[PDB]
Design a protein around this ligand. Structure first.
Ligand SMILES: [K+]
Ligand SMILES: [Mg+2]
Ligand SMILES: [Mg+2]
Ligand SMILES: [Mg+2]
Ligand SMILES: [Mg+2]
Ligand SMILES: [Mg+2]
Ligand SMILES: [Mg+2]
Ligand SMILES: [Mg+2]
Ligand SMILES: [Mg+2]
Ligand SMILES: [Mg+2]
Ligand SMILES: [Mg+2]
Ligand SMILES: [Mg+2]
Ligand SMILES: [Mg+2]
Ligand SMILES: [Mg+2]
Ligand SMILES: [Mg+2]
Ligand SMILES: [Mg+2]
Ligand SMILES: [Mg+2]
Ligand SMILES: [Mg+2]
Ligand SMILES: [Mg+2]
Ligand SMILES: [Mg+2]
Ligand SMILES: [Mg+2]
Ligand SMILES: [Mg+2]
Lengths: 211, 159, 58, 251, 105
RNA sequence: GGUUGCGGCCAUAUCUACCAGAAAGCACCGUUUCCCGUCCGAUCAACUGUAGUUAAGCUGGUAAGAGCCUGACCGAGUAGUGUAGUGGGUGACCAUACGCGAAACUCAGGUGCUGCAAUCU
RNA sequence: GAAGACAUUGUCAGGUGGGGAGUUUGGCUGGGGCGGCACAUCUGUUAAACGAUAACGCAGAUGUCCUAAGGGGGGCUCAUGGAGAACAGAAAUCUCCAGUAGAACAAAAGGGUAAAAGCCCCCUUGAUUUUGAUUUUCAGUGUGAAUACAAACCAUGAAAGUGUGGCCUAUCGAUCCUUUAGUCCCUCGGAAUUUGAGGCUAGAGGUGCCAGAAAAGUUACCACAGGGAUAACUGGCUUGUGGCAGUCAAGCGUUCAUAGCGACAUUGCUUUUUGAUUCUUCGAUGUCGGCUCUUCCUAUCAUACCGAAGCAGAAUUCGGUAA
RNA sequence: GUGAUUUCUGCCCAGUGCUCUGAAUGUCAAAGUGAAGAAAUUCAACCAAGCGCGGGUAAACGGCGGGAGUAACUAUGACU
RNA sequence: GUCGAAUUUGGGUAUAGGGGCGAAAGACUAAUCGAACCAUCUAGUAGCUGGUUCCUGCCGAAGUUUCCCUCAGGAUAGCAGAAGCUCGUAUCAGUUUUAUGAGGUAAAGCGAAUGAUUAGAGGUUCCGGGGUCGAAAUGACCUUGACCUAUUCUCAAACUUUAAAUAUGUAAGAAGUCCUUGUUACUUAAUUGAACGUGGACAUUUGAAUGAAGAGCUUUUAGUGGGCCAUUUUUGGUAAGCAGAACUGGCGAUGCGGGAUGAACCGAACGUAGAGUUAAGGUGCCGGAAUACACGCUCAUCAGACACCACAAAAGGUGUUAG
């Protein structure tokens, strides 16, 4: 079934998603995108690590599948299965075609082959949030996943708290007051606009000035 | 096969804008058109009668004829290696006055005022427009405004 | 064999050898395609003004 | 290497509404000549069958020759031509055409054709649509057959199709006599469904539908009085020997 | 389609020149007739040895004729023709569309 | 300034929830002989300004309201893009030079204006 | 002798007649054939924000249907959700609140529309007559389709107004011949009357190969003019497929990732396979195999010397220098 | 047409041919006959062979299938 | 092979070209046969191949539009020449500015409609179904999906509120502006307007920039209607010295210097000579020109060495150099 991945490497054709014109397409190889303790609060896992791309390329679905298993298998055995939260930030929507076969070129439009992603320079692929002490396992976990993909990518330690869009000291300023409350997986913040009645329903620790 | 109908490739061109559907406002109908007036052609999609062909969307021309609920516009279309004089029949919904010519007639009244006032004042006119000239010298003070020193910043990631 | 179907290559180059020239305006355009009710009056207007100037400069 | 299947059967039919293809699709399943195909694709006026071996596709055409009127021909495409023998590697295509006259159509026959096959009238219904096509004359019960070889050499088309039928309501049936095999020649008195409610008008017509016709039954048929055809065969008729109303079937 | 029997339309018969009642009927052929100059010329050329001289049309594609309607002013009996679009069916009389009937039988 | 009739531009005029409205005007509101219309004087028609009301409609105000609108030493001279080189890079792509230059996001402010005619403690 | 107004012979008319004659046996096309129609048309996209734009590109439609589904006027609000009402339930009919269109508008798709262009009522033939101008495709020819007026005659509405078919973008056809309506007008040429025929102006009968021949096969017995504009074979470009080599390491190997093996993945080399292509050759480069004979390549089967092993010896297994 | 001798040469007349001491009112040219008309003409009836209908013919061209059953655990398919 | 006959053979005689003869091969019929030979009709026709005869001077193309039993061809428009004619600072321009329109691509967006899509948290059950306690309940106690609330991960050639750059229409005055009061069957309640005028006022700062080997006009006729390459945009295809488009530049029709060599790359476009100067590219020797100068980096038991271009990757190295 599979051709070599070198053929469907570069972004040549326009985006060709599954719709009412394409209709009949095969299922994605990757299925579940979140792994580890995904019912964990925001306060548990501060230290964030990314796996950022550095090329304008196409990662296939089954390339992500093996990369997702390999990183999981190492990090589970070493540090235990509930010491992290892995998230895949790339979904394959682009359908690839194949000219599987009146004549050679006398009428030639390709059948659907398989799915793929479209990654850009500076785009994040993988993301892991963990404890402070358990850094080395996460960096070495994403090392082996780097081999399964084509092209060049680099691991980066983030300055932000977890998956939040807030810096290390910035999150502490707001959480020490009553300006943040936990949602479930992510988190909700106070806003200075809105109705003042239902701004007091939530955030009852704020509107006090004491502790 | 191929397809070249009267309204081919006009999906977005006779669309009605966002939150501007329904009946047209009445100043459209009260605007008076004489012969010799310059007019722009923009096709209202809600009215089907007296509609221009897609080519003439955007084009501008002169009025030559006035009738009951329409006007006669004359446009120059280029074809091959020459221009042909083409005569349209549009309803007033697909038309409006060109504001470029409105601006021009104001400048002629202004020139009549300048030349009449110049003779009463005492010679020297100068009425043509001049383009944007190169600017003159000056002395910029540093009082309460001393130059702040900048330099190129180092590289950081933040991702 | 198969041909080449279509192209617009060279066609602008050809067109600009001789102009792309304008169609020359005149004083008095043709009343071809003008309202018949307007023209049927305009005839009798110009007949009277000539007869007025002829009677004035008689 | 592109040329995978290595024999094709391109079946087709010139009619917009195909009864005979829908019949054929049902008939093929019963005896079950399909299995050897790699795959099936479709096209406007029929569908394509693809076979690995050449001898698998010939059994199908022999089977089709048995149950339906056809015309066909084969042509071939070359690929390799290996200089070591036993493998030149040709690829074959069989182009089959079903006869376009469906089971219940109204037909005008050609004059010479009509004189030969029993001296039957030119204005006829179809009967059975088997291996060969057979016609029936609704008024003076009669039958006549037409083989594909005799059809294709001088082809004609149906006057009006199943999509031209109109609903009538039967009031009485007066039997006259003959019954070769169907209790036939019933002088059916009928009135139109759009006419029964409003307006007074009645049509009275001899018909083959004698054994199964009862008063108050809705029957379908061709109503020839308001139809402007454009057939030259029909143009060569007797604008007055032609029946006003013909009823195709009960229901 | 289904036109009515009567029609009030413009007659142009000298005394009329106005809207009047017209009886509507369907236009019909008119018989072939020999002694027409074409038929006379055809039969001359066709005689002798040579066989078929003129072409003979076969490849016909159209399935429906255009309808023509003979009108006739009841005041002066002066006829006029009027053509309709192509159609597989055609009649003229009653058979009007009702309020909103469902299917029966 | 308030209200009425006819408007122009068509949310700064809409939406949700509470509050106030002297004077006159709107309004609800009373009646079924007549013209008229309905399954029904509910709507529509006629008659009375009489028996009564600001409870609704309508006009204004409030809300760290939703929407909508204008801006900004907000983001961003970022994304993109026209032109140039015997520039880099195995490639994918990327820097530089001469120019043009967004949108989301962020912050601040606003919440109908106005024409003609009539009429009002 | 027989036969006899019958045969026979002559002219015309019907039947039979590959025994014989003459002719024909579409086009596009990743060679030709089969199929398809990209041959006349319409919507979205390809199409790179004026217009124009190709491929046997992609997703679909057309040869119809309609005296109302056409024209004018009046009344009214839809899809859906919520809350109620004996039989009655997820779905019957009735009531109220929400409801920017999430419905409907003959059919493909795209636009358009809310005191309507939707649903229900009243009245109607402007889907009429006379001919010119203009837009689209374009040679600024025809055909089809459409736009605005004019001169009549009408429809509807209290009225302003609206209406020359279907809300808009598709739904169709020359010369010759036949035939119909009109003028009931012109001509039949030595002069008349009546039949008949021929004209002038406007429609219909049709060419879907849609600017429009009247048309079956076969050649392995073949022929001519040409063509590398075009196939069957070497060579060239490419390397999907075939062949050969890496990287990573979940597992196998009693025990042990890597002695020897190795999944999911991913990076290459080769032209000893086969495709794709049509650049060279059709005034000819002799098209399979075997026999014979020389040389070159190494990705090493054996032979020389070595290194590993789950190598005690023997026998093997993996690798290096080497053609 | 088949191709010495030996021994055999099955079933099929629906199709295409060939045929016929068969049916008769279905189709049917020219000339001739009748009516309408001033006449040219038009319309009707009448009507040869052939065609069609019915029978014969395979050492004439040719063809010799398809779907179901039940008997011996099965099978074969004698049988329906 | 056959050799006493269906044997072999001389002379005479008969059969003649759509005809003869044939124990049948399309055999033979005077070296000629799937239709002999000779003369004439005949210089038969060819959209097809080959050829087409002196010198210099000036100008100088096309492979594209529409229609054709059209696709190896024509007609038509285009590009080219020639002859001129009417006038003479002309009005124009493959250009910018100022003012003003038109557009739905790139980008962006989805806690905005449409469609796709990962995760939890809060709820809602008379209502898609199971279990736990049950005589049943429009019951509770657990549960997995459906919708509801505020969140969150990621997308769209045939989705979108917003929305560039480049390309694109018009205007920048004498054929103009203002005043005065004439014509009319059109138009208005109305000499009100409408259109075209009489008479008067306003001139070279007359109404942005730059340019202008003149501007405008007519007739007639050739060749051409196989194209190909390059940057950028691009659809088909795994790719191709592959197939098909978009804007510009080239080759074809073109030498000269450079890239060793080459239709298209860089430079630069040609009358015959002299002198000077440079382009692109170079200056160890071949070879005209510094074995110049300066700071560094590499040692290869396959070093490396100048765009288009004549290839190299993933992965590794206490090799050495900086961080
Ligand atoms: K010759
Ligand atoms: Mg060409
Ligand atoms: Mg061909
Ligand atoms: Mg465009
Ligand atoms: Mg309508
Ligand atoms: Mg042979
Ligand atoms: Mg070639
Ligand atoms: Mg080529
Ligand atoms: Mg040789
Ligand atoms: Mg070696
Ligand atoms: Mg024999
Ligand atoms: Mg032979
Ligand atoms: Mg011989
Ligand atoms: Mg000659
Ligand atoms: Mg020159
Ligand atoms: Mg502006
Ligand atoms: Mg878009
Ligand atoms: Mg578009
Ligand atoms: Mg050159
Ligand atoms: Mg050179
Ligand atoms: Mg070189
Ligand atoms: Mg090396």
């Amino acid at each position: 079934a599979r051709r070599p991945a070198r053929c469907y490497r570069y972004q040549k054709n326009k985006p060709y998603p599954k719709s009412r014109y394409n209709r009949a397409v095969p299922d994605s190889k990757i299925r579940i995108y979140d792994l580890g303790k995904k019912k964990a609060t925001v306060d548990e896992f501060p230290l964030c690590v990314h796996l950022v791309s550095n090329e304008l390329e196409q990662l296939s679905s089954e390339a992500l599948e093996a990369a997702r298993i390999c990183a999981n298998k190492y990090m589970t055995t070493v540090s235990g299965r509930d010491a992290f939260h892995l998230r895949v930030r790339v979904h394959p929507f682009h359908v690839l075609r194949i000219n599987k076969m009146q004549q050679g070129m006398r009428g030639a439009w390709g059948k659907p082959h398989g799915l793929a992603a479209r990654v850009d320079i500076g785009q994040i692929i993988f993301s892991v949030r963990t404890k402070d002490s358990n850094k080395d396992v996460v960096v070495e976990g994403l090392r082996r996943a780097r081999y399964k993909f084509p092209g060049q990518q680099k691991i980066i330690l983030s300055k932000k708290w977890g998956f939040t869009n807030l810096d290390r000291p910035e999150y502490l300023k707001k959480r020490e007051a009553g300006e943040v409350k936990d949602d479930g997986a992510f988190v909700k913040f106070l806003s200075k606009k809105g109705s003042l009645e239902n701004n007091i329903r939530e955030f009852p620790e704020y509107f006090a000035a004491q502790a | 096969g191929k397809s070249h109908g009267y309204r081919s490739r006009t999906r977005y061109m006779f669309q009605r804008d966002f939150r501007k559907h329904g009946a047209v406002h009445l100043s459209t109908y009260l605007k008076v058109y004489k012969v010799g007036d310059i007019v722009d052609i923009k096709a209202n999609g809600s009215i089907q009668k007296g509609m221009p062909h897609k080519f003439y969307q955007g084009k501008t021309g002169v009025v030559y004829n006035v009738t009951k609920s329409s006007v006669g516009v004359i446009i120059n279309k280029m074809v091959g290696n020459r221009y042909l004089e083409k005569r349209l029949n549009l309803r007033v919904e697909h038309i409006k006055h060109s504001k470029c010519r409105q601006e021009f007639l104001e400048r002629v009244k202004a020139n009549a005022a300048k030349r009449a006032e110049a003779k009463a004042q005492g010679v020297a006119v100068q009425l043509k427009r001049q383009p944007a000239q190169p600017r003159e010298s000056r002395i910029v003070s540093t009082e309460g405004n001393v130059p702040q020193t900048l330099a190129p910043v180092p590289y950081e990631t933040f991702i | 064999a198969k041909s080449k179907n279509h192209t617009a290559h060279n066609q602008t180059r050809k067109a600009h050898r001789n102009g792309i020239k304008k169609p020359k305006t005149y004083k008095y355009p043709s009343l071809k395609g003008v309202d018949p009710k307007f023209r049927r009056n305009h005839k009798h207007a110009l007949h009277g003004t000539a007869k007025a100037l002829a009677a004035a400069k008689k | 290497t592109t040329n995978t299947w290595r024999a094709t059967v391109q079946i087709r039919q010139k009619v917009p509404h195909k009864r005979t293809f829908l019949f054929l699709e049902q008939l093929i399943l019963k005896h079950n000549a399909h299995v050897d195909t790699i795959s099936i694709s479709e096209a406007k006026d029929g569908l394509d069958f693809f076979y690995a071996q050449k001898n698998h596709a010939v059994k199908m055409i022999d089977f089709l020759n048995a149950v339906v009127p056809i015309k066909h021909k084969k042509s071939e495409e070359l690929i390799s031509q290996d200089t070591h023998t036993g493998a030149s590697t040709y690829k074959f295509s069989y182009s089959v055409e079903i006869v376009p006259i469906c089971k219940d159509d109204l037909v005008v026959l050609p004059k010479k054709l009509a004189k030969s096959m029993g001296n039957i009238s030119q204005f006829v219904l179809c009967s059975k649509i088997s291996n060969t096509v057979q016609f029936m004359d609704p008024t003076t019960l009669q039958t006549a057959d037409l083989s594909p070889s005799v059809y294709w050499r001088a082809p004609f088309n149906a006057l009006a199709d199943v999509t031209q039928l109109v609903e009538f309501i039967v009031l009485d049936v007066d039997s006259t006599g003959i019954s070769r095999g169907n209790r036939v020649l019933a002088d059916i008195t009928v009135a139109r469904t759009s006419d029964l409610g409003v307006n007074d008008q009645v049509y009275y017509v001899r018909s083959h539908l004698g054994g199964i016709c009862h008063a108050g039954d809705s029957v379908m048929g061709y109503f020839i009085a308001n139809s402007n055809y454009n057939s030259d065969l029909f143009d060569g008729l007797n604008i007055d020997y032609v029946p006003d109303v013909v009823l195709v079937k009960k229901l | 389609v289904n036109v009515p029997k009567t029609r009030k339309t413009y007659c142009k018969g000298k005394t009329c020149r106005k809207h009047t009642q017209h009886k509507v009927t369907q236009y019909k052929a008119g018989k072939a007739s020999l002694f027409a100059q074409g038929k006379r010329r055809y039969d001359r050329k066709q005689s002798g040895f040579g066989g078929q001289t003129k072409p003979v049309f076969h490849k016909k594609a159209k399935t429906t004729k255009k309808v023509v309607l003979r009108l006739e002013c009841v005041k002066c009996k002066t006829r006029a023709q009027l053509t309709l679009k192509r159609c597989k069916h055609f009649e003229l009389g009653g058979e009007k569309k009702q309020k909103g009937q469902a299917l029966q039988f």
